[PDB]
């Protein structure tokens, strides 16, 4: 829940989080973004 409610005005997303959780894990769990 804490992660779900973050925004640019309060938090910054590290590049490694973006990489992992938007490419690697989603592809490994058989869920693909639009």
């Amino acid at each position: 829940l804490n992660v779900h409610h973050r925004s640019p005005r309060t938090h910054t997303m590290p590049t490694w989080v973006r990489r992992v959780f938007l490419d690697i894990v989603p592809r490994l769990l058989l869920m693909k973004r639009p």
């Binding site: 640019p8 005005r9 309060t10 938090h11 910054t12």
Partner: peptide, 5 residues
Amino acid sequence: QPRHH
């Protein structure tokens, strides 16, 4: 704080 804007 980001404070981007």
